Symmetry: D2
Subunit: 256 residues, 4 copies
């Protein structure tokens, strides 16, 4: 089946940053035809640690910049919502509505995304056991969602640390397509780039339906997640590597 690669700059810093990354993603979608690419960027970072950190340029501006990417590159789009009222306006450009990890249990937000008719990708909360994502999918189906994904992005392990329990991949696969978030899983809440690639190799060896990766032309200059965003020039190499590992491991993927 077609492997999903969700990629893009963490935050919509400007419409220009988006087209730059979008252009590279467009080029890669032309080379890796067996992959379905989806462009990602948040119009708002609603839970920065500090009140003084970069949040974004607002929903209107964000949706508009995202639409320019879809327009100019024919790329599918995904962005995250933070309150119920945002679902409708965001569904106009987003092919996949993303539900933030901390909000993965908010019934209204889930129901709001589901009735738009768009696909829904839920980031698994850092506090959530894999088996408890079952009711999250149930709520979405109840609300009308026909295409659902669950994203593994790490679990709380002591203070300011996250661990990836790969047993979660086959468990969540029982009720939804599973995505591995290579970026947020190595971040230290309140991260280490050196572990992005090895953990991503683990994900595809185990088996998943896609990977999620934040990438930026110059990570050290990003306004959010500068430590874990992948340099844009490395994207191609990472993708080719996971497709190769996926191919050789695939005959061994267990059936749910």
């Amino acid at each position: 089946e077609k492997f999903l690669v969700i990629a893009g700059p963490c935050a919509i810093e400007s419409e220009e940053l988006l087209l730059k990354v979008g252009e590279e993603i467009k080029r890669l979608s032309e080379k890796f035809k067996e992959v379905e690419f989806v462009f990602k960027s948040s119009f708002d970072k609603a839970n920065r640690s500090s009140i003084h950190s970069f949040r974004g340029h607002g929903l209107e501006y964000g949706v508009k910049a995202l639409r320019k990417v879809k327009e100019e590159f024919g790329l599918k789009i995904t962005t995250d919502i933070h309150e119920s009222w945002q679902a409708e306006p965001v569904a106009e450009v987003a092919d996949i509505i993303q539900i933030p990890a901390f909000l993965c249990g908010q019934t209204d937000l889930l129901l709001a995304a589901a009735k738009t008719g768009r696909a829904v990708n839920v980031k698994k909360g850092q506090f959530l056991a894999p088996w408890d994502t079952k009711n999250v999918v149930e709520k979405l189906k109840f609300g009308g969602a026909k295409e659902i994904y669950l994203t593994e992005r790490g679990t709380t392990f002591g203070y300011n640390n996250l661990v990836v329990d790969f047993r979660s991949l086959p468990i969540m696969k029982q009720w939804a397509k599973v995505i591995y978030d290579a970026t947020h899983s190595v971040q230290l809440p309140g991260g280490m780039r050196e572990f992005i690639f090895p953990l991503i190799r683990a994900a595809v060896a185990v088996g998943c339906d896609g990977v999620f990766m934040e990438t930026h032309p110059e990570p050290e200059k990003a306004l959010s997640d500068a430590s874990t965003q992948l340099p844009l020039s490395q994207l191609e190499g990472i993708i080719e590597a996971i497709l190769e590992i996926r191919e050789v491991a695939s005959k061994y993927y267990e059936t749910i």
Copy 2:
């Protein structure tokens, strides 16, 4: 003075709220040195199941809480789930409660601070104690003056919460600290037998108040049935914590 936040988990009906309100009123008259605050949720926004009880709406909820405040002269507190709810709730709530999962949502925090009311934030199960400093700053930026941080357990493996009591003195550096005796023992996705022992530890360590959900018949509760404390047991537990606090307070470390 020492804070005691209590009431039924969910606003199952204003009838229930008045019955519980009556007892809290009685205790408030008996324990004059304690500030009692009546709590109850107009909406359970993240029940595990889509088929579970959520409530009767914000409007019906704000009305029931208004009845309790009017009928008994008790202060009020309830939790909000999206920014637009702050203002209408502020009409009745003396203290606006920020849910544990939403303790990092900047807009929700700012909306609560803007109402001018007091704000009590439930520490996320994913949050380190020292990281609540930033939460408090968001509220200050937003204009809040009376800020509380509530300890309610930390993710410990799957389906389990542990209470790291080191958090009490750590958070006290920037806000008044409340200990949630109800939710700290519940198993996510709890054992009532541990509620009282951990409450004792909380006052022995030192905190500015205690939060406890109580119900006339916990067994019949539409939410947190396993952990809500039977109304009849509330008095003895309050007397016990005041006595322990009276003796232990002599050793509370300076802020």
Copy 3:
């Protein structure tokens, strides 16, 4: 019932250090008559992180120094063993044989301590659930132990950190007397003295049969656990405080 206070310098740095601390403990046992004091110090630190750290002066020397304390002060003694063969020689002076946290599951070491006829205090492993200490007590009883204690000393919480889950006190009380280790519970594996006293207050409010505390004339000069050993001059204050908190909380201790 009589409350137990196990105290002493972490390691037997010299026979002189022992008599100095022992003298203070003797004085306190005369004031706090409702308390049963037990003198503690290890003749060997068998698991220091570094091969270059202080281990001790050997078993013979250690037992000899401990015996001098019992002799000179009429104090009960406790020290920990690390291999089965040490049980017999150590039982000659030790009233309570301590089993190290990492070895709490070693059947032979438990059996070796049990057949000496002495009391046995097992430190609960950092990896052990409270309910699983039941079989630890079963093994000891099987081996002949009539007086058993289980010591709470923290649980692994992420990396280099320990948390105290006070629910363990009433759980372990179902099958043994429970001791709270005020020292090792705040240490950071591979600690914070500022949390020793507050957590100890929590322990007695919850309810336990005793407390364990490492103390030294000058902590900053100790050869082991210099960060968490309690200054000897503070011992009296801590003890008086926990006895007061214990008294006021006692009527509320639940029955097992």
Copy 4:
């Protein structure tokens, strides 16, 4: 070359050891680029229950392992539990295994290094990856030259272990790394369904070898019955990890 450590959890009888030995021998002839090491414990030193199976003794154990090495020409490895056992075990064991709970016992480590044999240390469930640096130094001080560190899960709440694969590249800085596919999925105080998937992750990430307990009829095993892999499945799993490793090795980060 790639290391594959395998055999029955406990030495239930030398008969069992020879039956498993025969298959490992066969696989060793089939996978020439793989160094196979036969493992089995002469004593289960920390069974939860006093009434469980421990074994038939060190002497009977060392003898059975000697038979396997003689009869099949396979290298040997078994674990020690107290210092005095190192020397007698070293007679037969090419690699001395240090138990997870005992990875910090200095005397046990030194006794193992002194025998001149290779030493494989199971990383304690309580140990951080970076803290194995000191373990390796103790062994070097003691004169060991061939040192291995085995990843076998980390305490995650109660009765659960999680595998933090970041540990593989971290430990590789000071020793050869082995991944224990059997114990990493067992629930302390496990699910076989996760053994193969995690093994795949281990080779995709990069390690110097894999450790796997296998038994002719896991169901009838006197130890780790829930997690020992049926002998018949061993071949397919080895072929699978060699294939994955062949492709993935191109991306292994430099030490």
